[PDB]
Amino acid sequence: PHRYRPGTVALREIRRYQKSTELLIRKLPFQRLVREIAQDFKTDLRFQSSAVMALQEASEAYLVALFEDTNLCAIHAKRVTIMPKDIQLARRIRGERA
Amino acid sequence: KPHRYRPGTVALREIRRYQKSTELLIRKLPFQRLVREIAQDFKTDLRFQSSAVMALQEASEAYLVALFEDTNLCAIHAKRVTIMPKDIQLARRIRGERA
Amino acid sequence: GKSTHPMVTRSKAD
Amino acid sequence: AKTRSSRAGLQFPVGRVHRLLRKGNYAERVGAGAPVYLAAVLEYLTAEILELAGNAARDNKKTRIIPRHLQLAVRNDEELNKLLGRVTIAQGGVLPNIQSVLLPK
Amino acid sequence: AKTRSSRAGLQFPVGRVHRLLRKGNYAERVGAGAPVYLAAVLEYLTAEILELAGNAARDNKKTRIIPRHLQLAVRNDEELNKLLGRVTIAQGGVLPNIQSVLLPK
Amino acid sequence: KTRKESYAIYVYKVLKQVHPDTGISSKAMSIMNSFVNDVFERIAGEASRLAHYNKRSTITSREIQTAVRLLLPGELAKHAVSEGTKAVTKYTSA
Amino acid sequence: KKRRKTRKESYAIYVYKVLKQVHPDTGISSKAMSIMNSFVNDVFERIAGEASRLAHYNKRSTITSREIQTAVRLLLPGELAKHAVSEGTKAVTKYTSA
Amino acid sequence: RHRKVLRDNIQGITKPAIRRLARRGGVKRISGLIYEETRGVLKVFLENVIRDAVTYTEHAKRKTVTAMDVVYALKRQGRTLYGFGG
Amino acid sequence: DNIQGITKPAIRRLARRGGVKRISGLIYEETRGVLKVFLENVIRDAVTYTEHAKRKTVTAMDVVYALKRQGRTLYGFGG
DNA sequence: ATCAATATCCACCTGCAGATTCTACCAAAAGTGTATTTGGAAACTGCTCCATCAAAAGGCATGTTCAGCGGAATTCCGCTGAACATGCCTTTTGATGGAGCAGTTTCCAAATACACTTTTGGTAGAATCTGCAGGTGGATATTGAT
DNA sequence: ATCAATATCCACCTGCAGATTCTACCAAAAGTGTATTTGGAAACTGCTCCATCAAAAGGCATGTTCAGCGGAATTCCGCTGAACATGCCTTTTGATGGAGCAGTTTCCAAATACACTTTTGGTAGAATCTGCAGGTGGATATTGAT
Ligand SMILES: [Mg+2]
Ligand SMILES: [Mg+2]
Ligand SMILES: [Mg+2]
Ligand SMILES: [Mg+2]
């Protein structure tokens, strides 16, 4: 057998997804979530196809940027593992949490 | 016999104290000198309304006080009780002022 | 001194 | 002679809100109801803040609202805090708040 | 017959920019030079991004600029980055960047 | 010479109805004025955007209402829409 | 009985002209063009809005090229503003000479 | 004409997908508690944008959420998006 | 040197209002830099408003407008 | 636990800055009314794009195993930062003249708005061209075991 | 270090979705004219801002001592990554029905323009009031040494 060490494949994946631009959440599951959430606000809603895609472009852009900030908080704590308290500190400082 | 409070005690007393009041905490004249100095680079022979300088102070101190809070959260996040430059730098980075 | 203001504030609605 | 504010039951100036809407270049026309509605909203929010500030003044055994009472009023209300999340009240100070890890044993 | 863009030496449409300033309710009146000036600035900034995006495309042996190329152009220029600090370019991805502490020893 | 307008007398009127035994410093009143001008711009600006997005040239109370719903958090939005509708109703009956 | 579809106007042909001036052998995908279109509209609003505020703050009822200029100085970072004011003034002068 | 029932769809935001987003964000190692926290943060994000977007839909008296509704809502939240019509 | 007029005790007090208990000695110099950047950004804009109005006097309104566009709205000096 | 030094709390007093009440003037702003004009709702309907379905296949999710290496607990020593007394200098304050410049009024040329026609550029849809995405194959760069 | 397992890089091929060029129609921009309005140049005035000085006040710079804290070294258990087997559900493609979006015509309630009268809000200036900041006294809670 041949096994890359812990961290090696992780760094390859970082280089990989930082190199490309395709969406990383599956298309249909994301569409279901949008419709589920939208339904609870108001019933009998339809969505332009581009409206859902816009919501996905925005959501992934948002989440990626947050993980960057989350990563900085972990490293600030001399860890390399991201944790909920890292996300929480980040959103607090961004003014999303307070 | 002399009497000495332990490190942190007055610090906590001062926190309670300045968190209770609202008066500006930088001396007025030094701040006023700094403001005019900085402005001189943008336009020479400038006058300032008295309130304009006060507005700049209200804003600057409000800004710095909030920044120290975030800075404090970053120090504690790193399991310290002492704020440090990297704490200010992390806060400013996440706020999007530094990047 | 009771509010004689005719508008329902959130505290009024509880 | 009878003012529009009185017609709507308001202390806030409907006519002035109307005039300010025209001058502000928000649109070509302004409907007759928009300033009535907006003046009501502005008055309601004013009442909301004055209420909580009066309480803040009263808690401090003061009868005169100062900027500190406005600050305490807003920062202690989750919803007003949000609305004014990017606003600075001069001479307001901050809410008393010490991180528990900083406290003595 | 001579278009206002040519009189001003511009590729961007002065007349359209003029009309858009009117419909947008920015003021009662709009000066004859404002659309000329604004159309020039919009064209300048466009040339600026396209220059840098074109290079990004060239670096990847592509002749057709895609959104990835616009992203690279903008995030690598300190000033466009700031100008678009709150903007999300769809299909743009991010810049390669690994925090050094995460690298092997 | 020229009059500097303010919401101050209106803010004072409301104060006397909600806290008839409470007063307000001039510094606190200035802050209240900043507040009313601020919310005015925000709602009016939002309504402005709304009408343009929909190719309408009139700002009606409907534009103000949607504006309020967008800007005000949870419950504040609710009571504001309520008072807004109350006033318009009352106004029309007169 | 046919109907005319309402034209969605765009900055697209103008961007293309400018694209050809800087990179005469380079083209642009339609997604990239849409983003450029978003870009031009965005900066348009931002500048005009800032200019609108300017005039109102000064009790002027006219937006002149001077309001655009100050607006640009307020919105654009350092160097971008410098060259923008240059192009802007260059153009306004040229236009007046006709 | 029997519309089906949508529920638990947040789990459609899978662990591998969350891991991929973290990788693009430059993240190397991920605590097991992250995936649930991420879904929570995403849900709040979508609630806020969709609510504003639908508010634009209702105001326009439409029954269809357009891309522009999403674009205007994002702009309000201070998260301007390019590429869909602004 | 005018930035140094923002003294160590003064910076310490602001931090105390921010709830800070222990302060590294390197903080004060870092703070002054941060304050200088803050004032530069706000003042540049304010003075830009000043020039546009053809005045030689920076008004409180100039500062208030500058703060608003920087996203740091201030109440109490005009609105 | 005792005991002392020091901070903190509370009731009461009072001089005064800041707030309030009183009055007059007036320009400007709000209301009222008639005359006029236009936007946006309604009804109608053409057409686009959305919801849904069917079918086939593989890319990708799931759940497991197994061990490396990360996080967190613990210990500990050096050093940094807090407390504090000493003494000195910067800031604050309040007055004064000095005056620079902001704010007000009037004036009038230039600039813009407004309206009618003519002209032309930008759009949409149809036909035609081509960059590159996706797959294959082979040389080389990287990683990890020994 | 050497060597094997695996990822990565790069060149070539090609069918086609997507881009570009081509053509015709019309809405929008340009041209010309008269009517209207704004903002600036100019003169002026009162205000607020700068400079200065002096005096009382008080905060800050400094140096020392020591406690408590930050960071380094060490240890280890459990978590989280790499790899794999399995199979499912997402993706792709192509069809259809029809909900609802978007274009068009008509018509009136609502809005605007104009003229004219009443009211009110802002200013100023004088006189008067009053909430509470600052200070005192004296009781006790807090903190730290022993
Ligand atoms: Mg539901
Ligand atoms: Mg640059
Ligand atoms: Mg240069
Ligand atoms: Mg399975």
Author numbering:
A (entry chain E): 38 to 135
B (entry chain A): 37 to 135
C (entry chain K): 477 to 490
D (entry chain G), E (entry chain C): 14 to 118
F (entry chain H): 28 to 121
G (entry chain D): 24 to 121
H (entry chain F): 17 to 102
I (entry chain B): 24 to 102
Give the text the authors published on this PDB structure:
The IE1-CTD peptide adopts an extended, v-shaped conformation with a short α-helix at its C-terminus. His481 makes one hydrogen bond with Glu56 of H2A; Thr485 and Ser487 each makes one hydrogen bond with Glu64 of H2A; and Arg486 makes hydrogen bonds with Glu61 on α2, as well as with Asp90 and Glu92 located on αC of histone H2A. Structural comparison reveals that three IE1-CTD residues, Met483, Arg486 and Ser487, occupy the same regions of the acidic patch and engage the same sets of histone residues as the corresponding LANA residues in binding the nucleosome. These observations indicate that the binding of IE1-CTD at the acidic patch of the nucleosome modulates the higher-order structure of chromatin.
The nucleosome, the basic repeating unit of chromatin, typically assembles 146–147 bp of DNA wrapped around a histone octamer consisting of two copies each of H3, H4, H2A and H2B.
